Amino acid sequence: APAPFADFAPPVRPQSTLRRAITAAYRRPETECLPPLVEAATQSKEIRDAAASTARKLIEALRGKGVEGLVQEYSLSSQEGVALMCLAEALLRIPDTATRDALIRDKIADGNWKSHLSRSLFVNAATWGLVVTGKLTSTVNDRSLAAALTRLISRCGEPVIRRGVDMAMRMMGEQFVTGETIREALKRSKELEEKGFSYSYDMLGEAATTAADAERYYRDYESAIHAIGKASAGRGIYEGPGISIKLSALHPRYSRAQAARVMGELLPRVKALALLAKNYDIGLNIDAEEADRLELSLDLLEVLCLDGDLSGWNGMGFVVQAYGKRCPFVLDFIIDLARRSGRRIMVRLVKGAYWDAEIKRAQLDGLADFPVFTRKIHTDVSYIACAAKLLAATDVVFPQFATHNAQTLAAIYHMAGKDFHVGKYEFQCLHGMGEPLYEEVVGRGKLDRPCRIYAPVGTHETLLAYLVRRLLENGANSSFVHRINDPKVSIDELIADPVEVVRAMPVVGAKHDRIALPAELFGDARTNSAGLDLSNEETLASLTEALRESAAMKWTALPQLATGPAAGETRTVLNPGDHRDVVGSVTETSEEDARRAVRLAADAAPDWAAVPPSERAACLDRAAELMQARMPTLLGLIIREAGKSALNAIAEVREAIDFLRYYAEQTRRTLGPGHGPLGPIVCISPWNFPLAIFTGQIAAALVAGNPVLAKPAEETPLIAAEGVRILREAGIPASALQLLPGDGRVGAALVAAAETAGVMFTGSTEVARLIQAQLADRLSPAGRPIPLIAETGGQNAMIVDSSALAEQVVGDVITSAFDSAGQRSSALRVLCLQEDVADRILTMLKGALHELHIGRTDRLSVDVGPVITSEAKDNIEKHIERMRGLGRKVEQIGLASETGVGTFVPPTIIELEKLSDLQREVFGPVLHVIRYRRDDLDRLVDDVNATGYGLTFGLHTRLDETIAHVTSRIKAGNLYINRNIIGAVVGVQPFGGRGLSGTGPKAGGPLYLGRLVTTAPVPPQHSSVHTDPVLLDFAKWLDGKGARAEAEAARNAGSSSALGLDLELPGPVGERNLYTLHARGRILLVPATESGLYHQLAAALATGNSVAIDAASGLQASLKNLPQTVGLRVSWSKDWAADGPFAGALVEGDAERIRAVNKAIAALPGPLLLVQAASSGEIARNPDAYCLNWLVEEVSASINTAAAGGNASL
Ligand SMILES: Cc1cc2c(cc1C)N(C[C@H](O)[C@H](O)[C@H](O)COP(=O)(O)OP(=O)(O)OC[C@H]1O[C@@H](n3cnc4c(N)ncnc43)[C@H](O)[C@@H]1O)c1[nH]c(=O)[nH]c(=O)c1N2
Ligand SMILES: NC(=O)c1ccc[n+]([C@@H]2O[C@H](COP(=O)([O-])OP(=O)(O)OC[C@H]3O[C@@H](n4cnc5c(N)ncnc54)[C@H](O)[C@@H]3O)[C@@H](O)[C@H]2O)c1
Ligand SMILES: O=C(O)[C@@H]1CCC=N1
Ligand code: PRO
Ligand SMILES: [Mg+2]
Q1: CATH classification of 67-174, choosing from 1.10.2060.10, 3.40.50.80, 3.40.50.1100, 1.10.510.10?
Q2: Which positions in this protein are listed as binding NAD(+) 2 (predicted)?
Q3: Pocket test for ligand 3, best of 202, 203, 244 (most atoms within 8 A of CB)
């Protein structure tokens, strides 16, 4: 039985001094990086003057010599230009040239273009919008574009369509690519090869999602090498053409986590392509991609350069990105490698293409700093400093200076001096964009320096997958190509020397002022939790030791009563991935000691309530600091006790830290002397987020002034015990927080105890219903229901239309459905695929499924761990077999035999016919797939809502009309657009749903603390200027009936309601996170008096709800002659169970009436109802007898605004 963590993440090879220096610079502060770059990039005054002169001459040439022309000729608006190009694109998808021309002449030009063209004409409008306008919009206003296309055709007819088609054909066949196939691209290269250029061809493959895709990219590269080599005809690697490849195209799991697979499976494929390039003697360049693939790619480069089968050939090339903080250390490593191997490595120096994405990734991951510079001028200095390094080593490497910036060019041209020969170094540029500049460089009559054109090769479909990334660059306010076209920009500004500008700044190397470090994402509110970089070798080495150490500890969990540990029954705690791995020991709580603990908490409550809220929050902040410091050890316990992967365990500890700091800040913002605690609160938590959810409930209750009885899930008591220990170390007194391990019997004894003033439950809907029933028996000393927060299961869907990008969808589906083996309340359960793209996406999804590694989670390479118990396994596998027994297609990955020592379920895809085939939440790694026709979208949303759950929901579409439609009709608490659906970042995506998924309020949001005090505070930003209009009509009706006091109360409720609140929450770049208050639905009213009914109706209507009024009240005569607007919202119910589901209830009566009604409500089928009760006299005395916070519904929506391939705002 293998030792825990003994193979966690061993590096591919022992790290040399040169490799360790690369790693040390990964996230070095920007003020530390620049000074040595400024020193390295310094040149003489004479050189600087000469370079400015050269740059000035180049830039004057460029300024003194397409779509814009079309737009001008026909006076097109921007939307008209974009729609015309979308139309042209579609028409070109028609292959038969004369067939197309006829469709245009006889059908399109005579209007009704909708009539003739299961896929929006405008799916790529974001890209064409960049071409026409220079600005990137994440989503497509398809109704605007359809109106514009109708308008321009009705105005200008076939001629404008003809010009649109020809324009599109030219840009897509000749400007964005050198050719559609390698043979065509080579034909078109002859002309500029004559003029002294050379070429490197890029076959536009990247991001293989399946083994099939990788093998297809491999054979594309192989066939291109043959065509290029045959065309090269012996010209060699400097004069003749080469090829560029992306390693991500050649393997579907190209990542540090899968390093062993990369070296075993990807390396041989690159070697075979390199052997072919060697035979023809052409270049083969490895392109640079994301920052977390840099160091892994060095391991491939090293093996290849030391492989004797490749000796005698100097065509191997490697890209280095000067916007990266590691660039100079990467170059030292490469130059040394070229010395040891004897290979003259071709080094392409670029600035870097993924800047937007790197900023967002570091912010999302809570890392210490960015792996790239944040000021564009720093990249320019880095570039020039690294060019100086390369030019001093031309004996050993072949520098290739890829840039379109004339200032950069001129600086390097003069840096290189007067001695030149072909083969010493070259410049490089991108096809289409750089020929203007470099035609001022190449040739004996210019600067007589060679330039290699990077030449994309691909069909229209292929080009558009990543044409945005390639444009977005030349289009930002900071880009040279953009600035030289701006007339407001002078030549003097363009020939400005970045080295000298940086040197003379006050602070050399300061971070950009408008980009937040990950720790500062929330500004003064609170400190963001910090993560761990699992691509950093130093981090992996350190984490390996801490994880090993955490596994030698003798973890225990005991009943920790206010007076001290209690004895009880003791059993071991086993690793769910391997029951031979004993993780610890738990002593469970007796039912008598459970009851004892509640009495002890009651007696302690005044002492804890009297601790000022700000000192209570200081305890939470201290606890957050201790967990941050203990994160590596906590990680190791979560991995082995709960079966979680390291990545998921990091995110869990972050969430615990975030809960603690968020509820501390909310407390400091809100709580004062009049917000009295409820009293002892019982917190019952689930196994599957055994630290974060556990901590959030307890931290909220404590900071609100309540002593807590913490009852963790029976499966995961050890991490709960550690969280309690940390909370007590931080200053929470033993009497304020008692730990009671055990099963549901401990939970139920706690709920039933008379001094229990409130319950916070997270778990299954079934168990929540049992707790609701127990509590219907009970009232508070004041005669009011015991507050219950119950956050329960989900049946979460994602809808995907034909505009979505399949590779993005598959990544988000694999993550959402099979991360944590699907053991997240938010996990994706039903994937809904538009019929037109269903087969393609499903094929890709099954391919990606078979790349997942299932096993014990103490290895970094494991993607999917075990399920928590053999009972959970049996329940999940029974579901799979029923489905398989109804004829449903079932796809499963094969499990390795090593899984036999634990409880594993293989990730599973099930193809359903209708959504009605699923009855209950299946809490496991099981994805169901259904298909829909686009016209039935609205019915599909109904089917999703019809399950009665309402937790998470995803939508993948580029089309605004679809977004508006679906998000206005779906009923769920957490929405996600063009991303995964498992985001629950505290204070950013406040988490929690409706219906069968919860009562609210949401955890990690601003209404949560108010449920745990007797008088609710006003949350930050909690108000609305909007007044419900049916409420206003009802207040007027009351005035007409003579109920003047109730009329005024109604108008007051109208004003106090926060319905219509609509906020954007601060978060990472490249995302919009929105928070809104909606109506809950239909509220059950159980009045006793006429005035009580009017107050209840006012509260419900003020918050946007409809109502069902208890007919047994006998108060029908009190609502004669209602305005139709109000009557539409009102119904009367004899049989409550028949008229649901309800979303809440308002009750009037004395204590025995409230208790009776409460039992009746708890017996209603379906969701748990948040009930509010008041006596007639309380309604008279207290205008907040019915609190409006609990009559609205919170909705969180997280939109990935980077999904179109770039970040506009950045
Ligand atoms: C032949 C060839 C081959 C390649 C590439 C280019 C060329 C010409 N690229 C793309 C390259 O990284 C770069 O994005 C473009 O060439 C534009 O940079 P220029 O120097 O031409 O212009 P320019 O001087 O305008 O520099 C713009 C660049 O500055 C950087 N930048 C912008 N804002 C910034 C900020 N706030 N802070 C820091 N830096 C900022 C970015 O790197 C951006 O591309 C690349 N890229 C890649 O990553 N891998 C590869 O393999 C290649 N391959
Ligand atoms: N909505 C959310 O925020 C959220 C988050 C995590 C998990 N969940 C849900 O939790 C479920 C999985 O967790 P679980 O298996 O640990 O849940 P569960 O319902 O099995 O058990 C949850 C807790 O209730 C206790 N319990 C069991 N019976 C009880 C009873 N009769 N009286 C009082 N307490 C009792 C258990 O000891 C445990 O602490 C899933 O349905 C999941 O969707 C929801
Ligand atoms: O594909 C890209 O964006 C960059 C430019 C050429 C190679 N890599
Ligand atoms: O992916 C694309 O379309 C761009 C075009 C040049 C290289 N990459
Ligand atoms: Mg259970």
Answers
A1: 1.10.2060.10
A2: 685, 687, 711, 714, 764, 792, 921
A3: 202
